[PDB]
A paper describes a structure:
The crystal structure of the mutant captured a distinct inward-facing conformation that was termed ‘unlocked’ because the transport domain leaned away from the scaffold, potentially providing space for HP2 to open. We also determined the crystal structure of crosslinked K55C/C321A/A364C/[name]/[name] [name] (FM-GltPhIFS). The structure was very similar to the structure of GltPhIFS, that is none of the protomers were in the ‘unlocked’ conformation and packed well against the scaffold. Nevertheless, the affinity of FM-P11WIFS for L-asp was similar to that of the unconstrained FM-[name] and about 100 fold weaker than that of the P11WIFS: 23 ± 7 and 0.23 ± 0.1 µM, respectively, at 10 mM Na+. The binding rates were about four times higher than those of P11WIFS at equivalent Na+ ion concentrations. The reduced affinity and correspondingly increased dissociation rate might be due to distinct position of guanidinium group of R276 in the wild type transporter and R395 in FM. The key conclusion from these experiments is that cross-linking does not limit the rate of the first Na+ ion binding or the rate of substrate release.
[name], which shares ~ 35% amino acid sequence identity with EAATs, has served as a structural and mechanistic model for this family of transporters. Like EAATs, it symports the substrate aspartate (L-asp) together with three Na+ ions, but is independent of protons or potassium ions. Each protomer consists of a peripheral transport domain, which is a mobile unit harboring the substrate- and ion-binding sites, and a rigid central scaffold or trimerization domain.
Numbering used by the authors:
A (entry chain A), B (entry chain C), C (entry chain B): 6 to 416
The structure:
């Protein structure tokens, strides 16, 4: 098969090349030949992605919850946890504000079938709150229904950790083997993630080629406007979150960045925050950080605290909804700030990662990707994912080193 | 949050306090204000309970089945197992007879929506027997359908133990790893049980507060009549089961009870038969029981043979059905004696425990808690659970010490 | 219960005895007393079998996929794997040709309820290909839907093995515990297989007794015609596959068979390819095979490469379809060759085994066992399973030793 190129560029080749192949078929031989012979491969891609969502949403958050489960962390760790959380929970809100001064999508509106998308009425507040609790975890998990799966997963991991403290040894052992299996379910799903990302050049080619064949040249303006909102969201994250909470603790932010240079760029290119752990810890020592702290937080911030992804997912959600012509009620809107945090925690730190967990923040707020409108819109961001992914990863790692430095000053 | 009180009293505070708050709103401001702002919290409680049912029904009985799976028990254990079973199977039957000379519920009848509850016709005997076998374990387990889940679980655990006897070591190896995960699934669910029981003060408050707000003071008579049927069932259990099968084997029952004093009272207050194992074994030695016998049976009787719970579940089932105006056919009636035994086996030995497993003996015999009538009735018993749980636990432990004594005499 | 006889004969007693009991009730006291009092036990049997299908289809193929998962096998193994596959993929195709020059079924036509079976239209090619990918593995697995379950299972096991190669040791470990759990799920399901095969004498008795009571005697002609197609398919397999690819590599096939004597007959009688592994390796040395080769391939060919089962399954599928009056389109027909290979890989190597995986190759090609027509036909093959199983097993083992010999010559 000989297909050995570096996935990042590889995909970008799919993206640019497929874009041109889309536009030149915008005129000339009509897009209907694309939708018949090109779209299928893109659909295969999308299917393989919103395939992984449910397993990784479950196991990932049983792990993640076990990773934060109080009490199962030194008071050094409570600090870095709370920091990590409020950095994701601010970063997503920022992504909303970027989705406010920018309207990504708005002006691209589509109805696929001459049938515009319309949301089902939100049940009573009582019934939606009660509905986050599953009635039969197996059931809820089985057929979509993401939020119950979340709640159960978190509850599970947390309980598991409290099994590991038990007097009995059969009990603690059992907790170990189980949690250890759930982890590994997740990790295997991430191996699958990578495997799909090898198909990403083709799938992207087909998706953006199809989207370019239709919709004319509207999309480029919008997609670039989204990339705008995202990145200027990220650097606003850095210059307003990190640079501000660095001076408050007496850290020189400039030199901080000069030390983080290698880790930030390495994450920027590899886009595997987990694969950019050795360089992040090399940068950990290089700036005088205690062994016992950077050995604890950086491998936690590897999988937890990906606040750049939280931002990305907020922005992406507003792009989807605006592309469909829906206005996001200030209840699902804060269900974004709430959800994209947990989706950030669940995100792998791998080339694909956050886009898959986008499915999760979209199965919430009622935008199922079984609906043609949504699936079509999701495919668009998914096409330009390769672009956003790099800087997003960069901010995911910048968060880790930042938090480590702040908790390090106080201990 | 500061909420640190002892859960038992804590809950009793919720129960009494919420009762009064119910009755004073029985007059005055109509109950409709309760149902809007108070009932939601109780509903959250009930949902959290009938949530755990399916996972614990599966894993719990895979465990339990492995715990009794012949041949994986010494003939020292065969005796104590047979005893345990016939004690649960008599105790439930006794609970039915207590639900015969007492009619708990009967005279409380309700139709919630002015629509009285009515059972779907019982299919052919052939088809109901065949239906205990699931057609696709995953499916049956997933969306309710309790009995198949049981049969599969039991078959599974039993098979697992026969893997542990296999010549091969990869086989006998893996066989544990599973069983060890399934256990731990169960045990984690019990940690969750505890966690919900920390919400129990509120949920109970809301439930009996709502029930008192409507239904007037009818309920107090009935609920107390149920408590009656239960407890006099328990003491009839002791004085007719235990006291008789103690004299048949030459044990002095009076002094027996004086030794069991500490264990029975400890169980009575902690209401955690599992948490009352150290005192049960202290009382085991204190009355001259062999190390090799009381080290085997008492930690089995901790989770298995909770025949006071079996009685409770018989009575409770008749309370539910009688509260709805349904008469229990002597076909579902013996499905109670058959089921509530298995539900006793699956019960944890934890504060909540049996209250959750009622869901199981009610998804059997066809009283799903998805039907408003049933959920309303279940909420009532569920409110006064804290009361019955104590003496019930007491009988669960008294059974354990009794059986240990008899198998010890014969060995 | 005293039921201790050797299962093989035992079942044949059920088969012959029940056959006569069927025909004498063909006249005389009409079959309706059978269908009322005899059929239920057969139905119980069938339910217990198509029960195991989904768990073993999942776990079996996660294991099985891990068993072949490249790269985690030496190039010594690549050879024997490719051989194993193309032997199964030729053997099933041969079973189709045997189902062509014989028309088994055709002329037995039945509509059980005076309603002949008719297939739902096959969706677009695009949509069936996309549909092999599951949308929510949990869901697809839960309610039937075989092929998605397969695709996910294979992807999973393969990914798991790539976890076992990971730099990290927590990862490497977790992968082990998980994969190790899925194995053991499968193996336990095979213990259940055996246990059901202890009920086989009765269930078979009831099945062929019912089938003989109706349909007159024409069934005997058809069933024996199936046995014909099967066995002469097997010996055509040997004399055209094995004997030819033995001469191509300079192996003396006659003496080869004289050495394989003990293994072939032992497999023929025990019908447990897995239980006939020690004798297969005894014959491995007895004909001068390298320790490092026959210790690797023969324990793989135990569970993988059961090409006699693949043939059996092709023939059985054509028997079903022809018994219903359906002609197998050359697309589901090659879905047979594609599927029955995987079902062969998943097959246990146990007395029951392949018949259960027949459920799988029948939920593919769209012949679900929820439709009475199919279930009635499947029950027929299932009745005469005991006969085909022996020679089938024999060919399953002959394939293993053959492959071992050839790869041994080339290395
Ligand atoms: N690739 C990002 C995560 C994402 O794509 O959302 C990371 O490595 O952190
Ligand atoms: N709590 C009881 C069981 C139950 O609540 O049903 C025990 O410890 O035995
Ligand atoms: N019994 C066969 C498998 C089957 O029945 O399909 C074997 O041992 O290989
Ligand atoms: Na994450
Ligand atoms: Na991060
Ligand atoms: Na038990
Ligand atoms: Na007990
Ligand atoms: Na197989
Ligand atoms: Na074989």
């Amino acid at each position: 098969k000989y297909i050995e190129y570096p996935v990042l560029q590889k995909i970008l080749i799919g993206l640019i090349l497929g874009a041109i192949v889309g536009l030149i078929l915008g005129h000339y031989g009509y897009a209907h030949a694309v939708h018949t012979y090109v779209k299928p491969f893109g659909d295969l891609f999308v299917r393989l992605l919103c395939m992984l969502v449910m397993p990784i949403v479950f196991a990932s958050l049983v792990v993640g919850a076990a990773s934060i489960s109080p009490a199962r962390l030194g008071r050094v760790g409570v600090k870095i946890v709370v920091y990590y959380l409020l950095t994701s929970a601010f970063a997503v809100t920022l992504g909303i504000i970027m989705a406010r001064l920018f309207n990504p999508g708005a002006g691209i509106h589509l109805a696929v079938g001459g049938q515009q998308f319309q949301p089902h009425q939100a049940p009573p507040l009582v019934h939606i709150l009660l509905d986050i609790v599953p009635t039969n975890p197996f059931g809820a998990l089985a057929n979509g229904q993401v939020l119950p799966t979340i709640f159960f997963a978190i509850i599970l991991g947390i309980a598991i950790t409290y099994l590991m403290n038990s007097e009995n040894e059969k009990v603690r052992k059992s907790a170990e083997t189980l949690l250890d299996a759930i982890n590994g379910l997740a990790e295997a799903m991430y191996k699958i993630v990578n495997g799909v990302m090898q198909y990403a050049p083709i799938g992207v080619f087909a998706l953006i080629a199809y989207v370019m064949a239709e919709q004319g040249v509207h999309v480029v303006g919008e997609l670039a406007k989204v990339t705008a909102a995202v990145y200027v969201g990220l650097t606003l994250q850095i210059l307003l979150v990190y640079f501000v909470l660095l001076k408050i603790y007496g850290i020189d932010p400039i030199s901080f960045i000069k030390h983080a240079k290698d880790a930030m760029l390495t994450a920027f290119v590899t886009s595997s925050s987990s694969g950019t752990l050795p360089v992040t810890m090399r940068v950990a020592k290089e700036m005088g950080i205690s062994e016992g702290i950077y050995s604890f937080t950086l491998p936690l911030g590897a999988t937890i605290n990906m606040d750049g992804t939280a931002l990305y997912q907020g922005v992406a959600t507003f792009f989807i909804a605006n592309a469909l012509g829906s206005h996001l009620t200030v209840g699902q809107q804060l269900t974004i700030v709430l959800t994209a945090v947990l989706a950030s925690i669940g995100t792998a730190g791998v080339p694909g990662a956050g886009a898959i967990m986008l499915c999760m923040v979209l199965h919430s707020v009622g935008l199922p990707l079984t609906d043609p409108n949504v699936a079509a819109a999701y495919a668009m961001i998914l096409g330009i994912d390769a672009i956003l992914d790099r800087g997003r990863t960069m901010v995911n790692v910048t968060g880790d080193l930042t938090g480590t430095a702040i908790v390090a000053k106080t201990e």
